[PDB]
Subunit: 157 residues, 6 copies
């Protein structure tokens, strides 16, 4: 009867994201991770790689599924038969923008957005900073799932 | 299988609170509104009045129940067989403090806290400001449930 | 004797902007809406369209006029014989940047900037989010003036 | 035709407040400084002292007048035949609370609140911190008007 | 040649505070922990207990010393022959107030204040929340030094 | 024994930056200003110009040296034999992002980041806003060192 969508680019998924997936799966009957397409072309990992990384990092969550999102998040959400979005907060989150989008999403489709603080140990990782640090030779392996580290190292070597 | 607690002093409940109750009830199988006791004595409405006002303002929510909370919120939550708290954000929310408590609550009891932005029209009411304005003769009746306005007017007259 | 400038790109004007125009016109003898040019070319509506949309959306404000701005806002302001800017705050406003600019504008030209919170119902619309949602097929017609909706729909059809 | 109210406890007035008075007087035909009563008794300077300090610190502002406020600020404002409040922002301002009050004041009485950033040199003084520092023997004389320093020193000696 | 003061009430000291002590001691030749007196009487631990808890929790920091502070922090700082204060940031810090005080402290005594983010694992503990949780029976032992837990448990038993 | 790095693009250095250099030099035995390379090519001043401007603006700081940074800031810091970064806060600073980077920098290299509020008079200048205003003909000469104004005027004339 209950369901939530966890939308994002996940380029790549981090342990911060996985923390949020785990909490959504614990509180909702079904969770759908919506991987948004990168239309303007310029990400690090292509869509298939991002799906695989999320799937491989979430095998311990039987009530969670992974799907590609297209168009408005609220359209995807309602297409899943749901009316809730679950999003993580971490250090560096643009929360004012997240609030603006949440209020807009409520306005246009009646979809609620629930925010949850990510675990402190994963509160400073973001996809973008993780990539930037790793590209410059820094070790972020404790902040990403092993399926992601495997792929990141390959791009390095 | 799913449940959330909505804790607060509700002295008195506002339409901002009710907005949040409605969204929790739409997303969780069961919702429990936990009315905290005022230990240091100094609220406007006594416990029984606060319970009644919440009950009367939530008759349209069949999966919601009202109970008095004692001790740590996380103790009450876990006593309800749940592991989630749902709290509203509005203008004037001390969000840094709410985040601190959420991280502490997660640490001590494993309880997740989900934050949701209250509807814009109810985003500037708070129990405290509602009381202060009404005591000084201002009309806040559009921001409180009719069961609360009834009681507020009585204290005025 | 009193006057304020309301500067912006207005691509397109929203009811959030109009709310702010109305409050400036109520508090100042004259208001000038300064539509900034888009130098690096990349907006949705060209300058003439933006002027028309603002004019058509403000016919109820007899003491308000619309002009194209060029160069520093403070140069435009002082060219209007004024020393005040009126700007709206809404959800998602980069207020730190607005404050930085206000302090800089005061420093270089002695111009004061007055900030006013937009009405809650219009607090989550922005030109950019309105366009993005509409382009993806979402209904934002309640958050934009009818002169803008008319033009937006035409670009859709 | 235009007017603004500048409300506060002014216990005592600071150069931060005077900065804001000056900007209101430059932009509005008339300005009224509303000194709020201290009902629960516990300020440093009594009402008459606060009025005198504001008057003496504003002799260079011919279109500004000083009055004691009673009850809701919006009641005082409308009693002045005005519909605008002008308030300063400085370091340490509880802006979320100021926003909440502004939205509430708009809701109950249709009164607009304009916020303006205080001059950087006066951005870290507040009545409360000024008193606390001076009581402990610190020199805050550059951040307060001479009429206030005169009175502060007397309480010291 | 270099020195910093770490001021606070430390009622009681937390691992968040100790984290900050460690970083100051690593970056400055000498560190002085200034324990402020509680003038209005109402803390949990008396001055001697607070000193002991800090001393016992910092035996691994040979260049750190503990002293009682009286009066303005900047007076204490300059009495130590120093011109720097080091303060931690954590979740729930009133940073605007900390900034206001820092700018005031710079103004009155030329003392600089350096802010450092506490370690994520200790970012949600504060003296006040630690006491409140423990008094209600919650386990905060991982967030406080063992010398503090020893004393906290005694007050419980 | 003590040292700090002050990293930035300094395109160009402002008096806000110099304020921070001065405070670092007063509190640490050695300070290194790390000028980051602009890899994606698009700054106003080339690397040699930026170095010269910083050097010329810091002749009064004998314990400060200027060097070009390459790669991760923490790699540069540790290459200097240091473990501290000193960064300024001003109006418009993206402090959430600065905090995220600080926590990440601590995680990957054990390097501490100390934040200090810039002097109020220099709190609203940034390299980017200074350039934008000057390019549009505004006078920012009081907010930049004379070595920078000299070069800025040359580009104008």
């Amino acid at each position: 009867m209950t369901g939530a969508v966890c939308p994002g680019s996940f380029d790549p998924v981090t342990l911060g994201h996985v923390d949020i997936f785990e909490r959504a799966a614990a509180q909702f009957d079904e969770v759908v991770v919506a991987i948004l397409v990168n239309p303007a072309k310029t990400g690090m990992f292509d869509l298939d790689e991002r799906i695989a990384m999320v799937k491989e990092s979430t095998t311990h969550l039987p009530n969670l599924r992974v799907q590609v999102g297209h168009g408005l998040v609220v359209d995807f959400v309602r297409s899943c038969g749901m009316t809730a979005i679950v999003k993580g907060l971490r250090t560096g989150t643009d929360f004012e923008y997240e609030l603006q989008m949440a209020q807009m999403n409520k306005h246009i489709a009646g979809v609620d957005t629930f925010f949850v603080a990510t675990a402190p140990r994963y509160s400073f990782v973001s996809s973008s900073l993780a990539k930037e640090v790793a590209m410059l030779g820094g070790d972020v392996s404790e902040l990403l799932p092993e399926p992601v580290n495997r792929r990141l190292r390959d791009r390095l070597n």
